[PDB]
Every structure is written in structure tokens, then in C-alpha cells.
DNA sequence: AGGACCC
DNA sequence: CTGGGTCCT
Ligand SMILES: Nc1ncnc2c1ncn2[C@@]12C[C@H](O)[C@@H](COP(=O)(O)OP(=O)(O)OP(=O)(O)O)[C@@H]1C2
């Protein structure tokens with residue numbers, strides 16, 4: 194029937210993890226730097242012009258007093274990421290990750306259990322925790338309203354637990370599907386939560402200013418819709434189903450058009466241990482086989498540290514970039530799957546390397562990544 | 570092995 | 577010159 198989903202979204206995640214490590218950064222404007230980029234900054238610096246993924250020189254040209262911290266190494270953020278997911282998994286076991294700082298949790302069964310605990314007395318004392326989207330009025334006789342309020346109380350417990358137990362703040366959105374939870378969780382930022390009652394749903398989706406803002410509609414699909422005279426959510430709502438299939442495929446079409454009406458029936462899928470783990474690095478230039486081999490050696494070494502834990506990988510891939518992506522994989526021989534070990538691994542990779550780049554020709558590499566997948 | 574998508 | 581991830585085709 195009607196679900197109750199929460200979407201949890203950590204405030205300035207990398208910045209926030211750095212500030213926890215020393216508050217000498219907190220209260221001071223702060224950017225987290227990767228290569229020539231500040232990828233994220235604290236709010237104490239966001240109001241001073243600093244934007245996410247902003248060029249590091251333009252970031253100084255709007256704030257020369259910002260503290261820069263190098264967050265090229267994801268290790269600490271990743272460990273924090275799973276601590277968050279695991280805490281949420283305590284509430285209900287089916288938690289879906291999206292990147293390092295977002296989780297969906299299906300609160301439906303939990304919402305039911307709590308209501309069954311209540312008497313017909315306390316069913317009228319129930320209150321909302323956090324903002325109601327659009328200041329819509331609650332109607333306690335509306336059983337959908339009552340379930341969504343209970344969901345907002347659970348969302349508040351989640352947020353409180355994350356803070357008491359891990360020191361992290363985040364936003365939460367409670368709604369009836371995954372699309373809507375995610376759209377509404379950002380209505381009040383940072384460190385706040387908002388709940389979407391059913392009658393405000395159209396208000397929510399029409400609140401958007403371009404189709405590119407609908408999660409599921411990425412870089413290419415946007416540029417495609419934009420080339421059919423489709424700019425607004427309503428343009429996509431009202432556009433012809435038949436034509437739309439012809440440019441995107443009956444799959445993309447019928448899904449994104451449904452999204453345009455705030456409709457999303459995709460289940461919250463339990464993420465669990467990952468399906469892959471890699472190590473990446475980019476650079477301005479790399480046109481040798483010795484340079485490449487050396488970079489590749491570092492990536493494998495860090496990867497190998499992570500390769501312990503839960504279980505073992507039975508495939509390896511190598512990714513390069515030109516001047517887009519090009520990969521080459523192959524499986525990892527039996528005896529190799531026992532944890533030197535670098536030596537034959539480096540050989541596999543370099544053979545994979547040579548397979549895809551002419552090592553006696555000019556070649557200009559701007560990225561290198563080593564991936565372990567197919568985990569058993 | 571590449572496509573799209575996500576943060 | 578971001579450092580990671582997911583599923584589908
Ligand atoms: N292409 C990218 N788009 C969005 N985020 C990206 C992209 N590439 C790298 N990232 C990040 C930027 C941030 O450091 C990190 C997450 O950024 P978020 O958009 O989730 O938001 P945030 O936690 O930094 O702050 P906030 O928007 O306040 O919640 C992720 C690696």
C-alpha cells in the first residue's frame with residue numbers, strides 16, 4: 194500500500210568529518226580540498242562565497258582566509274559513512290546507501306508497529322517532529338497523515354542518535370516514496386527535517402525550476418529533453434509519451450515521466466557490504482610506462498589493505514583516461530586469492546595496461562584507477 | 570566494456 | 577588535475 198520512507202542527508206560531510214577531528218577548524222571558514230578543487234566546505238565559509246566543486250583559486254578570490262584541508266584520501270569519510278549506515282540499520286534493517294552521505298530507510302513496518310502499540314487515546318496526541326512541508330495543516334483523522342508524523346518522530350530519533358553516538362548532523366525528509374523523501378529532505382538546511390503530506394506533493398515537484406533537478410535525470414537526459422523544448426517539470430508532465438520513448442527508450446521515458454508527477458515505486462534496496470572498492474588518482478600528465486606502473490603500484494597497495502575485511506574479490510579492472518574512460522578487466526587467479534602478493538598482481542595489471550595503450554606510441558593519461566569487483 | 574546515473 | 581560508487585545494456 195502506502196509507504197513511509199526517510200531520506201537522510203549529512204551536513205557538509207567531508208568538512209563535518211574534518212571539523213570533528215579538530216575544532217580549530219570549526220568556527221573558522223573551512224574547505225576540503227582535492228587536487229585543484231575545494232569539493233566541499235563548511236557553512237561557516239559557504240556564506241562567504243565558497244561553493245562546492247569551486248576552483249581553488251576562485252575560492253581564494255572570494256575568501257583568502259579559508260582553511261584548506263586535503264581530503265583526497267577517502268578512508269576516514271568512508272569509515273564514517275558505514276558507521277552512519279550501521280546506526281540507521283539498527284532502526285530498520287533495509288537501508289539503502291546513495292554515495293557516502295545519503296541513506297534511504299523504509300520506515301513502513303516500523304511505523305505500523307508503533308501505531309499498533311498506541312491506544313485510541315494517544316492517537317490524537319501524536320505530533321510532528323520538524324517542519325511540515327509548505328506549512329500544510331495536519332489532519333489527525335487522516336491515517337496517511339498520522340503515519341507520516343510517526344515517520345518524522347522516527348526520523349528525529351535517527352538524527353538524535355547519529356549526533357549523540359557519532360557527533361554528526363544531517364537533514365532528513367519523510368515522504369511516501371524515495372523520490373519525494375529526497376526532494377523534501379533539503380527543503381530546510383542544514384541539520385533540520387521536513388515531512389511531506391500527500392496534498393503538498395504537486396507543490397513540491399512544481400517547486401523545481403529545471404528537469405535537471407529531478408533525481409534520475411542526469412547530464413545527458415537533460416540535454417536531450419532540453420532539445421525537445423522541455424524545460425519545466427510540467428513540460429515533461431504534459432509532453433507526448435510516444436515521442437519521448439523514441440528519443441530515450443520506453444524505459445527512460447516511462448520512468449522519468451512518472452518521476453515528473455512525483456511518482457516513484459522503486460523499493461528501498463538493502464545495500465549491505467559493497468560490490469566493489471577501488472583507488473583512484475588523477476594528474477596533469479603521465480606519458481611513460483614507468484610512471485604508470487608506479488602509480489598503479491601505490492593504488493594496488495592501498496587497495497590491498499582494504500582487501501582484507503569481510504571477503505575476497507575474484508575480478509580486477511584497470512581504468513584510464515584520455516587527453517573518455519577505458520577499462521580492461523580479467524579474473525584473479527586462484528592462488529592469488531590468498532592474503533608477497535603485489536608481484537603477480539602488478540603483472541596482470543600492466544598486461545591489462547599494455548593491452549589498451551600503445552606503450553611505444555605517444556599517449557597522455559590524466560587518470561588511473563584500480564578496481565576489485567566480483568566479491569565472494 | 571561501455572552506458573547512464575548518483576554523491 | 578575531483579575520488580569515489582550503483583545498476584543496465
Ligand atoms: N560531481 C559531483 N557532484 C556532487 N558532489 C560531488 C561531485 N564530485 C564529488 N562530490 C563530492 C562533493 C562533496 O565533497 C561530497 C558530497 O557533497 P554533497 O552534495 O552530498 O553535500 P555536502 O555533504 O558536501 O554538503 P551539503 O550540500 O550541505 O549537504 C561528495 C564528493
Ligand SMILES: [Ca+2]
Pocket residue numbers: 202
Ligand atoms: Ca545531498
Ligand SMILES: [Ca+2]
Pocket residue numbers: 202203204205206294
Ligand atoms: Ca550532503
Ligand SMILES: [Ca+2]
Pocket residue numbers: 405406407408409410411
Ligand atoms: Ca539530477
